[PDB]
Prior knowledge:
This protein is an alpha/beta fold. The protein has 2 helices and 8 strands; from the N terminus they run E-E-E-E-E-E-E-E-H-H.
Amino acid sequence: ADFEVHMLNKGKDGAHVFEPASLKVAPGDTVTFIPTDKGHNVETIKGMIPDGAEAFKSKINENYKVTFTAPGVYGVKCTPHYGMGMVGVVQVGDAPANLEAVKGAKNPKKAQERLDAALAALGN
Ligand SMILES: [Cu+2]
């Protein structure tokens, strides 16, 4: 199954957002990060990806389709807007095994707030 995340300068959750900011998928599903507004990208957050996964980083303004295979939670950021909290979580499967490992990852405050909110939205 294929899902979409819009990369936006603003949205319901404020400035510099992924919409949705949380998504539950199954192994092998894809998510396309869409440059609805210019100036964004998507990148894995260090320490917030599960065993079996590989880091990625899209180009600014790239329409970017990612396949998520290994189970667990994946924290993602927009490289330029990470400091302002432009982040999201994609969770592959239920009962993510890496939940405590990713909760320990260091993030600037606005990113941490939104990551914790996304984790809670996903049932964690
Ligand atoms: Cu951005």
